[PDB]
């Protein structure tokens, strides 16, 4: 699969991004899974005023509420797309929550988590619960 390629990071390798059923995305690079909300989601919410991120070291199960993204008109929980452990959060978002509006699917990522084996993600891709973002 293309997930193997992204995990291996051999020459000419490229990270793969997938979108979920709930306007979230995840990207795989090595064993690091980066998670954010989609461009669609940031547009639904309007200008973001606060981002509440998970604590580093948090053990997540698929579906756990992990973050909150908040505009004046609306708030939205962001759920873990896979089981794993939070290892990094996007420190830019404290001063610049609007980076999520500007670059939702790239620089406005919310957190990074480790997954040791991609069997769960492989299942969700095979089911087309999650789909490749092109």
Give me the resolution in angstroms, 1 decimal: 1.8
Tokens, residue 117: 């084996």
- For 53, list phi and psi in degrees, rounded to 5: -100, 155
Q: Which of 49, 94, 39, 52 is nearest to 73 (CA)?
A: 49
H/E element, 54: none
Point out which residues pair with 78 in neighbouring strands. 67
Burial 8-40 (b: 16+ CB within 10 A, else e): eeeeeeeebbbbbeebbbbbbbeebbbbbbbbe
Alpha-carbon separation of residue 27 from 5, 16, 70, 73, 75 (angstroms): 13, 6, 23, 29, 23
Tokens, residue 106: 């790239």
Determination technique for this entry: X-ray
Point out which residues pair with 75 in neighbouring strands. 70
Q: In what order do the strands lie in the sheet with 75-79?
A: 48-52, 65-71, 75-79
CATH architecture for residues 1-134: Beta Barrel (2.40)
Whole-number Å distance between alpha carbons of 19 and 16: 10
Whole-number Å distance between alpha carbons of 85 and 113: 5
Whole-number Å distance between alpha carbons of 100 and 49: 10
Q: How far is CA 58 from the centre of its chain?
A: 15
Q: Three-class SS of residue 106?
A: coil
Say how many Å lie between the first and final Cα of the chain, rounded.
Answer: 16
Give me Rg for the CA atoms of the chain: 14
- For 28, list phi and psi in degrees, rounded to 5: -110, 120
- For 30, list phi and psi in degrees, rounded to 5: 60, -135
Write down the domain spans for the chain. 1-134
């Amino acid at each position: 699969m293309g997930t193997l390629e992204a995990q291996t990071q051999g020459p000419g390798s490229m990270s793969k991004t997938y979108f979920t059923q709930d306007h979230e995305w995840l990207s795989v690079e090595g064993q690091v899974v980066t998670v954010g909300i989609t461009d669609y989601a940031q547009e639904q919410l309007g200008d973001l005023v606060f981002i509440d991120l998970p604590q580093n070291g948090t053990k997540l199960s698929k579906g756990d509420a992990a973050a909150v993204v908040e505009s004046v008109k609306a708030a939205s929980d962001v759920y873990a797309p896979l089981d794993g452990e939070v290892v990094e959060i996007n420190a830019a978002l404290a001063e610049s929550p609007e980076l999520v509006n500007q670059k939702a699917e790239t620089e406005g990522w919310l957190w990074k988590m480790t997954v040791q084996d991609e069997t769960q993600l492989e299942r969700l891709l095979d089911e087309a619960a999650y789909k490749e973002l092109i």
